[PDB]
Amino acid sequence: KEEGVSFLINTFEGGGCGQPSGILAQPTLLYLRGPFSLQATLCWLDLLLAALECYNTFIGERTVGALQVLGTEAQSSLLKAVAFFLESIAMHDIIASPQEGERYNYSKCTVVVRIMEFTTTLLNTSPEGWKLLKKDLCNTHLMRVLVQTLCEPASIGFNIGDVQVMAHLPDVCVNLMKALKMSPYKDILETHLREKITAQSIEELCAVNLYGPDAQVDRSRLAAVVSACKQLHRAGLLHNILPSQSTDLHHSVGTELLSLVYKGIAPGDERQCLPSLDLSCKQLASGLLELAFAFGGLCEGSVIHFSHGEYFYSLFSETINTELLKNLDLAVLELMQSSVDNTKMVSAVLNGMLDQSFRERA
Amino acid sequence: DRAKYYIQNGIQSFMQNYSSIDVLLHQSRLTKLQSVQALTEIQEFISFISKQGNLSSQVPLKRLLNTWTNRYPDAKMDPMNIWDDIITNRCFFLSKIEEKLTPISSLIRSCKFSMKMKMID
Amino acid sequence: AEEEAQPPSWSCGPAAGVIDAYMTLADFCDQQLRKEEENASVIDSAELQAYPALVVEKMLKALKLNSNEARLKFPRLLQIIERYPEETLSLMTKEISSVPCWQFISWISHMVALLDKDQAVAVQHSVEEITDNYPQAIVYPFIISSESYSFKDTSTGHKNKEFVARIKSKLDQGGVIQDFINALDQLSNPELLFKDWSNDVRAELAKTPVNKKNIEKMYERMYAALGDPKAPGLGAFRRKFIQTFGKEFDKHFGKGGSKLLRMKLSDFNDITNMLLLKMNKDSKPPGNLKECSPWMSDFKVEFLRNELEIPGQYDGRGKPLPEYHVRIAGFDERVTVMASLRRPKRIIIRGHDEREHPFLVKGGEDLRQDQRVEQLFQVMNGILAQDSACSQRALQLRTYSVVPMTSRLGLIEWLENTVTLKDLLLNTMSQEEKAAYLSDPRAPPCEYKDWLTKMSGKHDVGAYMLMYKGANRTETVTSFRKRESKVPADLLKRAFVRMSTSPEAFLALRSHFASSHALICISHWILGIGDRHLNNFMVAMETGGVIGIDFGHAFGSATQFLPVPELMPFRLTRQFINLMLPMKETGLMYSIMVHALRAFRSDPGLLTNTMDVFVKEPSFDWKNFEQKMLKKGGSWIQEINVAEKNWYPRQKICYAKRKLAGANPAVITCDELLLGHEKAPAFRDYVAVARGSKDHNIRAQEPESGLSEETQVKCLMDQATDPNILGRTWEGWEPWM
Amino acid sequence: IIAKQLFSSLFSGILKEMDKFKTLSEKNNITQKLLQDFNRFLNTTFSFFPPFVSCIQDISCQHAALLSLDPAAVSAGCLASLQQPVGIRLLEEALLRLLPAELPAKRVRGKARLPPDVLRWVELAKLYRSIGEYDVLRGIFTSEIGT
């Protein structure tokens, strides 16, 4: 009856080691050396094992109360652990001709995202009572590979950067960093994240403005840090490092709107980064200083002529959709006070407010 | 004038000869996949003569290398109708082309010599 | 002037094809040495030893060629004169990399055999060649090495022998499948294993002893069949023949067999024929399928076969660009064995390449004497792409794949809608001419053969010392030829027009039937056509054109061997030339055979080499051509040995036939060469009958050694329709029709 | 019209029952006159595919003087192509009556060997012409030398 709890018992009464299959695929591969290994080995033989592990976990607690006592010596020390060493070898080989090389890459992802799927899928579900993460002392490899969720887009494909694989990557980091939230000791996190928290954070963000020309290449890296931090919203420990960078640095992204809007710089895609930048920003900073920035920014031949109306308005034509969808997002009735405090602007903000809200919810 | 009417009618005469093909003879195809081969250089000749006489200025001193460079790498299987019937076309091409660009010279001789060469082996 | 041709090719730098001068230089020296092996002298042996060791490298350089003449060069280089002790070791190492690594392949049986004994210094050189090609992309050499090496380990220092030993250890590992499939497909019918095994041991129990480990081992193969099918030796290699048959027969076979163990009494060599004969008529009734089809029905299809590189075997081919095309996959369980010589078995490989492929099982046959013949075929029709007049008419003739697996078995490709004109002709004649009565069992080829027995002495095994009268001959071929032969003229034309819905396609496709025929008939004048019944050239009903599959009898042995005395250029049975319309146009498809001929003629070197290592190489062509013909039928076995005492059919069969390229007319000198044995006045003059009376003596007079274009053909036709030669030869060639 | 089978059926349903119905000598001689109409037609229509279908329809019919009085290869040979060379085969067995009886060159069918040559000729294949020439040319005498 109890699928898992039941049948697992009678199996361990019969045998303890009555499930695992294969034995690695790394030196034997340097002894053989072929293309089909790259096809079954590194696309399923590793993942078939991973998968049977995955779905066997969510069943019964046997991966905790019974697996723990299976081996600690001969045949065992070549299973889970070295499988990790094939995840370090997975970042490695993910880095290092046409369609064949591509099956190499897409395979390397198709495995490694499932392995992240399983570090997660394990951690946030399998370690109950929080006493099993300490099993994989190669706790290090996984960190050093998953976190490079920006150096991963470089390691796996850029095509897959487009192929809706990074329509799933933010969700996968969401997952792993989600098992990294709250659940494990908060020290894992700083050994994980406290590797490029700030420093670059301020440097690339200011740097889009210091950069200027050849912008879009760099904007790629920007929306990588941007989106990847949007992944951090789903994650923790942002609060030690990113709400001081929220009060200071997201306000700084508001100054980014303020300065960048004068020049009309760069293309409509960087005009899409400002929606991003302000998105990952406002999704963490206060809206008080924003609503303030509405009217306040407003009070602060042809050129200056339309300019008076433009730094008055276009900062609220462009970013309108995300600002509406930003403080409608979290606080009712704060806005109120904002808009009346403005005067004569009230109409665009409030009309696009009712408007865009109306659209989103129903 | 009339060479275009009779060349179109001979075209439709092969269009006539193309109806019988159950267990086709080679003679069915090869002599056709050859006579069309000559015809192509023919109509080509008409067209770029009509232009090179009316272009530019003296830009036929500069262009037209196209037609020799299309005339040059055309291949023969085994038929021996080919390597003469191309000379049938190409030779009238030398006389009339030379007669239509007139209405540098050492490059001309190197060019006709480089014509001659491969048209032998 | 060649010295002022070739190294300047290497000094110029752009183009000037290295081949264009190199290979001509190599042909020049090789003909220098053969012409010098004909005669020995002082300035001829001293200059001859200046000239030959020269061309030996440039046939490695300019190897981006067609490369088969190369494969013919290397063992030629080594065995021909002083095999260099370092020179060849080093640059013949840089070659197969400098040239296509797949030039490594083109000589499948040469290399493997060479590795062992034929090279002597491969274990020093080509062992490292074969050991760099070997671990990468070499699944195909896995098969052939296992045949040659374990045969004979000649004399060694330590290194030479340990190496090849471990090389064969690289085909028990990552090739454990190789012998697992061979030990798989090691089938089928018991009769061929026992009868052929018993011939094999039995013809070595009669003469001098040599019975020590020969007979002691030669007991063991059979004990495998029958002492192990319930012992641990076949608990590893089970079959369905072993499931019951290797047991029901194990009970009785154990006692007579272990009585055989210590038998060792030459007269009992005959006595086995009691037991064997019974077990023979008891082994034809059960060969009824459902044994190897379920027993083989076990396929992995796991882990991409564990990354297995086993293709359809022998799919590794010739010419460069090796892409490891085809793939094994899984077989269709249905199987059917069928009515033929060894009772061979029809397999359906189901290739992974979105396609299946039906092959054949010849478990009771070492398919080698036919390998280089088929490859020599694709040299026939693979050369005719430089003659115009061969292209002009699409003059090639069909190939396929001969699959030489273990020393004991090979497989062969099999097109569908290609069928034996005998079989088809017969049944289609049947549904056309009478129900089944017809005449064939009353009084045509039974009556005629009875008539031949009543015209010599007594039975039929003779008549050879007889065969007299020149008028009565015309009575035999007039009578039976006209009646019989005219019948399936109508039946063959009727089969074509019956098989061409379109009343016109019949006369359309006759062209490709015919063309096929001229092509096969020169194909045989190339070399002997024996065992080659009307059942042995086989027509294809696709393009309605014919293809020739049999290769038992090569060169002389086709015509020469005493037990069956045969001689014709090619199967010109009657009804076939009846089917070409009242033509005449035959006597000029003659032209097909001529352009064909000159196409062969012009280049002596290639064909020369090819045929040289093919006649000399296989034991299964002279040292086991005995083994071949005896394996076929018994009547040969007693005459051969007493004819083949201290006698070698190698370099002379070759010289005679290369001469056959030269200008040997009327088959006339070939006829002589088979004549010289048995018997000069009995048979020799007889072959001269197609040479005697003037009307056909045109087959004798125009014969001139002087490089005559069409002569060899102009006669070669009426050198087959000389009714004498037909009515005499044998019971199989149905010269009736 | 592609249903040529009506036509061969038709003559099968014209010749067969004019073997099984009533009297047969005179009539069998009579229907043979129609080959004049076939061939008068063959001199009338210029360039026409279904006439050809009548020609195969003709050598199909168990007839001699169709095989004789035919210069189809002259005409029904200019466009039909393959349907003209089917005639000769049918022609040879009965119209070439002096070829399987091996008799002088005076009686053997004079023309009906030659239209088969020019007909296999217009089809200047690569095996067809090269053959037909010394075929019919061989059918007399001083060709062994010229060839």
Swiss-Prot record, chain B:
Subcellular location: Nucleus; Nucleus, Nucleolus; Cytoplasm, Cytosol
Modified sites of kind N6-acetyllysine: 118
PTM (free text): Autophosphorylated at two clusters, the T2609 cluster and the S2056 cluster. Autophosphorylation induces a conformational change that leads to remodeling of the DNA-PK complex, requisite for efficient end processing and DNA repair.
Segments forming a coiled coil: none
Domain of life, per lineage: Eukaryota
Family listed: Belongs to the PI3/PI4-kinase family.
Disorder named in the UniProt entry: Immunodeficiency 26 with or without neurologic abnormalities: A form of severe combined immunodeficiency characterized by reduced or absent T and B cells, recurrent candidiasis, and lower respiratory tract infections. Some patients show dysmorphic features, severe growth failure, microcephaly, seizures, and impaired neurological functions.
Binding partners and assembly: DNA-PK is a heterotrimer of PRKDC and the Ku dimer (composed of XRCC6/Ku70 and XRCC5/Ku86). Formation of this complex may be promoted by interaction with ILF3. Component of the core long-range non-homologous end joining (NHEJ) complex (also named DNA-PK complex) composed of PRKDC, LIG4, XRCC4, XRCC6/Ku70, XRCC5/Ku86 and NHEJ1/XLF. Additional component of the NHEJ complex includes PAXX. Following autophosphorylation, PRKDC dissociates from DNA. Interacts with DNA-PKcs-interacting protein (KIP) with the region upstream the kinase domain.
Function: Serine/threonine-protein kinase that acts as a molecular sensor for DNA damage. Involved in DNA non-homologous end joining (NHEJ) required for double-strand break (DSB) repair and V(D)J recombination. Must be bound to DNA to express its catalytic properties. Promotes processing of hairpin DNA structures in V(D)J recombination by activation of the hairpin endonuclease artemis (DCLRE1C). Recruited by XRCC5 and XRCC6 to DNA ends and is required to (1) protect and align broken ends of DNA, thereby preventing their degradation, (2) and sequester the DSB for repair by NHEJ.
UniProt name for this protein: DNA-dependent protein kinase catalytic subunit
Swiss-Prot record, chain C:
PTM notes: Autophosphorylated at two clusters, the T2609 cluster and the S2056 cluster. Autophosphorylation induces a conformational change that leads to remodeling of the DNA-PK complex, requisite for efficient end processing and DNA repair.
Residue ranges annotated for the FATC domain, each copy included: 705-736
Signal peptide coordinates: none
Spans annotated as Catalytic loop: 528-536
Residues the record lists as Phosphoserine modifications: 340, 430, 635
N6-acetyllysine sites (modified residues): 230, 247, 251
Compartments, as annotated in UniProt: Nucleus; Nucleus, Nucleolus; Cytoplasm, Cytosol
UniProt superkingdom: Eukaryota
Region named G-loop: 337-343
Region (Activation loop): 548-573
Domain PI3K/PI4K catalytic: 331-662
Described purpose of this protein according to its UniProt entry: Serine/threonine-protein kinase that acts as a molecular sensor for DNA damage. Involved in DNA non-homologous end joining (NHEJ) required for double-strand break (DSB) repair and V(D)J recombination. Must be bound to DNA to express its catalytic properties. Promotes processing of hairpin DNA structures in V(D)J recombination by activation of the hairpin endonuclease artemis (DCLRE1C). Recruited by XRCC5 and XRCC6 to DNA ends and is required to (1) protect and align broken ends of DNA, thereby preventing their degradation, (2) and sequester the DSB for repair by NHEJ.
Involvement in disease: Immunodeficiency 26 with or without neurologic abnormalities: A form of severe combined immunodeficiency characterized by reduced or absent T and B cells, recurrent candidiasis, and lower respiratory tract infections. Some patients show dysmorphic features, severe growth failure, microcephaly, seizures, and impaired neurological functions.
Record family assignment: Belongs to the PI3/PI4-kinase family.
Subunit structure: DNA-PK is a heterotrimer of PRKDC and the Ku dimer (composed of XRCC6/Ku70 and XRCC5/Ku86). Formation of this complex may be promoted by interaction with ILF3. Component of the core long-range non-homologous end joining (NHEJ) complex (also named DNA-PK complex) composed of PRKDC, LIG4, XRCC4, XRCC6/Ku70, XRCC5/Ku86 and NHEJ1/XLF. Additional component of the NHEJ complex includes PAXX. Following autophosphorylation, PRKDC dissociates from DNA. Interacts with DNA-PKcs-interacting protein (KIP) with the region upstream the kinase domain.
Protein name, entry field: DNA-dependent protein kinase catalytic subunit
Organism: Homo sapiens
Gene behind this protein: PRKDC
Full-protein interval shown: 3392 to 4127 of 4128
